[PDB]
Paper text:
Biochemical analysis of the DARPins show K13 and [name] interact with [name] independently of the nucleotide-bound state of the GTPase, and have Kds around 30 and 10 nM, respectively. The X-ray structure data of K13 and [name] in complex with KRASG12V show these DARPins bind to the allosteric lobe of [name], at the interface between helix α3/loop 7/helix α4. Analysis of the amino acids engaged in the interaction between the DARPins and [name], showed that K13 and [name] make extensive interactions with the histidine 95 and the glutamic acid 107, which are residues only present in [name]. We conclude that the main driver for [name] selectivity is the interaction between the H95 of [name] with the W35 and W37 of the DARPins K13 and [name]. The crystal structures show that when DARPins K13 or [name] bind to [name], a structural change appears in the [name] molecule on the effector lobe, especially on the switch 1 and 2 when compared with two unbound KRASG12V-GDP structures. However, the exact conformation of the switch 1 loop in the K13- and [name]-bound states differ somewhat. This difference is most likely due to their different crystal-packing environments. After [name] binding to [name], a small but significant increase in the dynamic mobility of the switch 2 loop is shown by the increase in de-protection observed by HDX-MS, and some small perturbations of the effector lobe HSQC resonances are observed in a few residues in the switch 2 region. Nevertheless, HT1080 cells (bearing NRASQ61K and KRASWT alleles) expressing [name] present an increased level of pERK and pMEK signals. This result could be assigned to the inhibition of the GAP binding on KRASWT by [name].
Author numbering:
A (entry chain A): 1 to 30, 37 to 166
B (entry chain B): 0 to 137, 149 to 154
């Protein structure tokens, strides 16, 4: 069966783990596996997910995730301007590690339910257009965009 | 013991003209860089703060500063689509054909990002172009 190796990247505190947990969970709660079997567009496939949380600062290991990953969920938080510009650094590093300008990626604006917004939707849409990638706003807390983000990344890998 | 370079980088990111000028009046290093090699001019160029770009350039910002990925402020403005900033950087002597560590010129990045007017502005300033500078989803008389 087809496997999709997905890597979740982004600055410390942008909600990488919360997003991943929200995708993987099979029931609501107010232990699980990051190899999740799903059916996408009629075909049974495996999502093989790697979260960089805990190793964002660890250069040698960041590069190891980038080597193995087939597609990248590039997560920033909409109330953290530094995390948004960090996407540029992650994208440039992915290009260099993989020696390619055409790596599957999706830009994810997380915590979209919070009122303290410092990155405008327009800025993020424009950046995604320049990068040639989809942009999705997400919130694990309000269950918005999470399925769409991961589904869209799989579609980007399939198109490559 | 406050790091004025760090504060200047933060002010440039935020587009805070007051803070930028106050910090530079206090001697803050205009070419201070972060862990990735981004200077205040890199930040102003990427974020699209035209006023801040002009202020930094007037006070001796190095237009040629290259980050850890070999990118100059011109690479950043060209990729993200900030035409007025591209123009000002070229006016202040930016190297139009500077290559980053992937071998990319600012034109290579602008072309891939679909910024035709920027590609043309770079060509007007002597940019090299070749068949590998492919276009993404998108005067002329002067260039031709």
């Amino acid at each position: 069966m087809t496997e999709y190796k997905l890597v979740v990247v982004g600055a410390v505190g942008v909600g990488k783990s919360a997003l991943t947990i929200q995708l993987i969970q099979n029931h609501f709660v107010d232990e699980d596996s990051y190899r999740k079997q799903v059916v996408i567009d009629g075909e049974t496939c495996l999502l093989d997910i790697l979260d960089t949380a805990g190793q964002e600062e660890y250069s040698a290991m960041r590069d190891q995730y980038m080597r193995t990953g087939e597609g990248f969920l590039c997560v920033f938080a909409i109330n953290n301007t530094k995390s948004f510009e960090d996407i540029h650094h992650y994208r440039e590093q992915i290009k260099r590690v993989k020696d390619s300008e055409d790596v599957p990626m999706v830009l994810v604006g997380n915590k979209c339910d919070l009122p303290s917004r410092t990155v405008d939707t327009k800025q993020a849409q424009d950046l995604a257009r320049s990068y040639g990638i989809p942009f999705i706003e997400t919130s694990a807390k309000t269950r918005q965009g999470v399925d769409d983000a991961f589904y869209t990344l799989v579609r980007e890998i399939r198109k490559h | 013991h406050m790091d004025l370079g760090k504060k200047l980088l933060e002010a440039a990111r935020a587009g805070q003209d007051d803070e930028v000028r106050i910090l530079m009046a206090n001697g803050a290093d205009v070419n201070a860089s972060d862990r990735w090699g981004w200077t205040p001019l890199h930040l102003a160029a990427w974020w699209g703060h035209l006023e801040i770009v002009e202020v930094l350039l007037k006070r001796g910002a190095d237009v040629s500063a290259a980050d850890l990925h070999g990118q100059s402020p011109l690479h950043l403005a060209a990729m993200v689509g900030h035409l007025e900033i591209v123009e000002v950087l070229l006016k202040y002597g930016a190297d139009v054909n500077a290559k980053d560590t992937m071998g990319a010129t600012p034109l290579h990045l602008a072309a891939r990002s679909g910024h035709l007017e920027i590609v043309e502005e770079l060509l007007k300033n002597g940019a090299d172009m070749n068949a590998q500078d492919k276009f993404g989803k998108t005067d002329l008389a002067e260039i031709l």
